[PDB]
Amino acid sequence: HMILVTGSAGRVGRAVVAALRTQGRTVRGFDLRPSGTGGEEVVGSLEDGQALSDAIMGVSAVLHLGAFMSWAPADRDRMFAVNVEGTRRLLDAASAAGVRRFVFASSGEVYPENRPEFLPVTEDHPLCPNSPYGLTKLLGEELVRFHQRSGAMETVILRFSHTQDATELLDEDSFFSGPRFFLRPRIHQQQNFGNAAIAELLQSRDIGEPSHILARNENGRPFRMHITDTRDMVAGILLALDHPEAAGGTFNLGADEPADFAALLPKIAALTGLPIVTVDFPGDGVYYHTSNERIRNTLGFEAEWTMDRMLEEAATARRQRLAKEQRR
């Protein structure tokens, strides 16, 4: 019963592989780069037919978390090659090899949570992505649905919440949470994204010392979104892998409730000591609630990493980091 995990060197993938191996289960990784764990893994690409064949031999179940997420147009062809065509051929290879279950990591971008038609967003919400990435995940879901209806291989679609390791939340250098909660990282981010008007706007709000940012829309409505701990995502993925009721299912996977930035930022500020700069962005901004009621009542999923628990652990890590910079 070997389990194949693609994206096994990534945030969610590596934690899934570690949980499985801690259970003593046989796992094979599949990622562009080594995990650094020395465990069995393919180093290679989802675009490579040879790698796909090597990866699937003797495999009983597949956790397909490997995907490319990019903003720039120059990366769009690659994103479709990896996310759509890579997923298509991985499905066909899995099916032909007699894989028993295939779990697919999708995204809230298939709805999209950035522009919902109603709240809370349920699995029955229309799938109308507005980003090329979200489009790739929708096409991916459609490939999965085809195998679901047509073969012996069981499938599960899991639409991921935005996911962070707790320690990422209070790290200015983290890819997502830095720009999300800290003003200067966001300036650098937007500069690199080439969003000139935004980067100079943010610049205009800098107060002479590092600060947090409380993001709001043009009407002063604070951003609101789900941020789920990697450990809760791992728990849901293992449920999708093992629970009998997950077969043929599609589930939102994430924490119960979103974080409202008007309540989150002062909690973050209380742990960092940094002041808060409030910025009203042009547009309607971000504001969503996503229901995980289906996965809770079907698979018995229970998220346990509340923002408070996550923040408590993020803060401890930040303080240990400082004490090295500080040498205190």
Binding mask 127-166 vs ligand NAD (x if CB under 6 A, - otherwise)? ---------------------------------x-xx---
Cα 289 to Cα 43, 73, 235, 254: the distances in Å are 37, 29, 21, 11
Shortest separation between residue 47's beta carbon and a second copy, angstroms: 13
166 binds a second copy per the rule CB under 8 A: no
Cα 177 to Cα 62, 275, 313: the distances in Å are 29, 17, 15
Shortest separation between residue 106's beta carbon and a second copy, angstroms: 14
Residue from 67, 139, 187, 239 in contact with a second copy (CB under 8 A)? 139
Per partner kind, with CB cut-offs from 5 to 8 A, the member of a second copy, Cl ion, ligand NAD, none near residue 163 is ligand NAD
Asked whether residue 33 is marked as a ligand-binding residue, the answer is yes
> Which stretch in 8-16, 91-99, 122-130, 294-302 sits in contact with ligand NAD by CB under 6 A?
8-16
What residue number has its CB nearest to ligand NAD? 10
Give yes or no for a contact between 327 and 290, defined as CB atoms under 8 angstroms apart: no
Instruction: Say how many residues touch Cl ion, by CB under 5 A.
Output: 4
16 binds ligand NAD per the rule CB under 6 A: no
Q: Is 102 exposed, middle or buried (0-12, 13-18, 19+ CB in 10 A)?
A: buried
32 binds ligand NAD per the rule CB under 6 A: yes
Instruction: Count CB atoms within 10 A of the CB of residue 297.
Output: 10
Q: Which is nearer to a second copy, 194 or 266 (CB)?
A: 194
310 binds ligand NAD per the rule CB under 6 A: no
Q: Which is nearer to Cl ion, 93 or 238 (CB)?
A: 93
47 binds a second copy per the rule CB under 8 A: no
Taking the C-alpha atoms of residue 112 and residue 134, their distance in angstroms, rounded to an integer, is 7
Peptide bond into 258 cis (omega under 30): no
21 binds a second copy per the rule CB under 8 A: no
Taking the C-alpha atoms of residue 50 and residue 58, their distance in angstroms, rounded to an integer, is 15
Per partner kind, with CB cut-offs from 5 to 8 A, the member of ligand NAD, a second copy, Cl ion, none near residue 31 is ligand NAD
66 binds ligand NAD per the rule CB under 6 A: yes
Taking the C-alpha atoms of residue 168 and residue 227, their distance in angstroms, rounded to an integer, is 11
Per partner kind, with CB cut-offs from 5 to 8 A, the member of a second copy, ligand NAD, Cl ion, none near residue 97 is none
Q: What would the two tokens of residue 76 be?
A: 């769009």
Asked whether residue 11 is marked as a ligand-binding residue, the answer is yes
In this structure, what are the phi and psi dihedrals at residue 43, rounded to the nearest 5 degrees?
Answer: -100, 105
Cα 48 to Cα 17, 44, 87, 234: the distances in Å are 22, 7, 11, 27
50 binds a second copy per the rule CB under 8 A: no
Taking the C-alpha atoms of residue 191 and residue 163, their distance in angstroms, rounded to an integer, is 24
Q: Is 222 exposed, middle or buried (0-12, 13-18, 19+ CB in 10 A)?
A: buried
Q: Enumerate binding residues for Cl ion (CB under 5 A).
A: 48-49, 180, 215
Positions in the binding site for a second copy (CB under 8 A): 80, 84-85, 88, 128-130, 135, 138-139, 142-143, 145-146, 149-150
